[PDB]
Amino acid sequence: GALTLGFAQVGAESGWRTANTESIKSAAEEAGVNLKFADANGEQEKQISAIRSFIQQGVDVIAFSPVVRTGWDAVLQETKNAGIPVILTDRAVDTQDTDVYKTFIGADFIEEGRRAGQWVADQYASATGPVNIVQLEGTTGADPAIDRKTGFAEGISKNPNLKIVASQTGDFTRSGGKQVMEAFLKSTPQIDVVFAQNDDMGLGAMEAIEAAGKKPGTDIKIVAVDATHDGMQALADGKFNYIVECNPLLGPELMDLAKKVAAGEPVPERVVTPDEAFDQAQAKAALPNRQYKLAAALEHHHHHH
Ligand X SMILES: OC[C@@H](O)[C@@H]1O[C@@H](O)[C@H](O)[C@H]1O
264: burial class by Cβ within 10 Å (0-12, 13-18, 19+)? exposed
Interface residue with ligand X among 13, 60, 111, 147 (CB under 6 A) is 13
Interface residue with ligand X among 243, 246, 249, 255 (CB under 6 A) is 246
Query: Is 207 a known ligand-binding residue?
Result: no
Interface residue with ligand X among 3, 4, 7, 17 (CB under 6 A) is 17
CB of 42 to ligand X, least distance (A): 9
Asked whether position 171 contacts ligand X by CB under 6 A, the answer is no
Handedness of CA 231, 236, 237, 243 (dihedral sign): positive
CB nearer Zn ion, residue 105 or residue 193: 105
Query: Is 112 a known ligand-binding residue?
Result: no
Give the SS3 label for residue 193: strand
Asked whether position 144 contacts ligand X by CB under 6 A, the answer is yes
Q: Where are the alpha helices (DSSP H) in the chain?
A: 15-31, 44-57, 73-82, 109-123, 143-156, 174-187, 199-211, 229-237, 251-262, 280-286, 290-298
Convert residues 34-73 into a mask of x (bound to ligand X by CB under 6 A) and - (unbound): -------------------------------x--------
Q: How far is CA 16 from the centre of its chain?
A: 7
CB nearer ligand X, residue 144 or residue 204: 144
Asked whether position 226 contacts ligand X by CB under 6 A, the answer is yes
CB of 111 to ligand X, least distance (A): 12
Asked whether position 136 contacts ligand X by CB under 6 A, the answer is no
In the list Zn ion, ligand X, none, the entry touching 14 (Cβ below 5 to 8 angstroms by class) is: ligand X
Helix axis angle, 109-123 relative to 143-156, nearest 10°? 30
Q: What are phi and psi of 207, to 5 degrees?
A: -60, -45
Asked whether position 16 contacts ligand X by CB under 6 A, the answer is yes
Query: Is 275 a known ligand-binding residue?
Result: yes
Asked whether position 147 contacts ligand X by CB under 6 A, the answer is no
d(CA 6, CA 29): 14
Note the maximum CA span of the chain: 68
Asked whether position 301 contacts ligand X by CB under 6 A, the answer is no
In the list Zn ion, ligand X, none, the entry touching 276 (Cβ below 5 to 8 angstroms by class) is: Zn ion
Within 80-109, which residues bind ligand X (CB under 6 A)?
90-91, 106-107
Handedness of CA 23, 29, 33, 35 (dihedral sign): positive
d(CA 272, CA 255): 16
- The amino acid that residue 262 corresponds to is A
Q: Give the CA distances from residue 59 to residues 74, 79, 83, 258, in Å, rounded to whole numbers and listed in that order.
A: 18, 10, 10, 11
Q: Which residues would be at the binding site for Zn ion (CB under 5 A)? A: 26, 73, 92, 97, 143, 147, 229, 245, 272, 276, 297, 303
Residue 267 DSSP symbol: -
d(CA 233, CA 263): 42
CB nearer Zn ion, residue 57 or residue 77: 77
Query: Is 200 a known ligand-binding residue?
Result: yes
Q: Which residues are annotated as a binding site for Zn(2+)?
A: 22, 29-30, 73, 97, 111, 143, 147, 199-200, 229-230, 245-246, 275-276
Q: What does the binding site for ligand X look like in residue numbers (CB under 6 A)?
A: 13-14, 16-17, 65, 90-91, 106-107, 144, 172, 198, 225-226, 246
